[PDB]
Amino acid sequence: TMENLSRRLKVTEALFDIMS
């Protein structure tokens, strides 16, 4: 559950930071 949250937050970081 928590490790899963972590994974999802990193996916979100990659989209937010798509290219910067």
Partner 1 sequence: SHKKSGTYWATLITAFLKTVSKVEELDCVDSAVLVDVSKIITLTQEFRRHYDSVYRADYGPALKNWKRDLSKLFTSLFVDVINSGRIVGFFDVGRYVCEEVLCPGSWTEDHELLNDCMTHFFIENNLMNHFPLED
Q: Which residues bind partner 1 (CB under 8 A)?
A: 1-6, 8-17, 20
Tokens (6 digits) for 8: 């999802």
What does each C-alpha distance from 17 to 3, 4, 10 come to in angstroms?
21, 20, 10
Cβ at position 15, least distance to partner 1 in Å: 4
- The rounded distance, in Å, linking the Cα atoms of 5 and 20 is 24
Cβ at position 4, least distance to partner 1 in Å: 7
Cβ at position 9, least distance to partner 1 in Å: 5
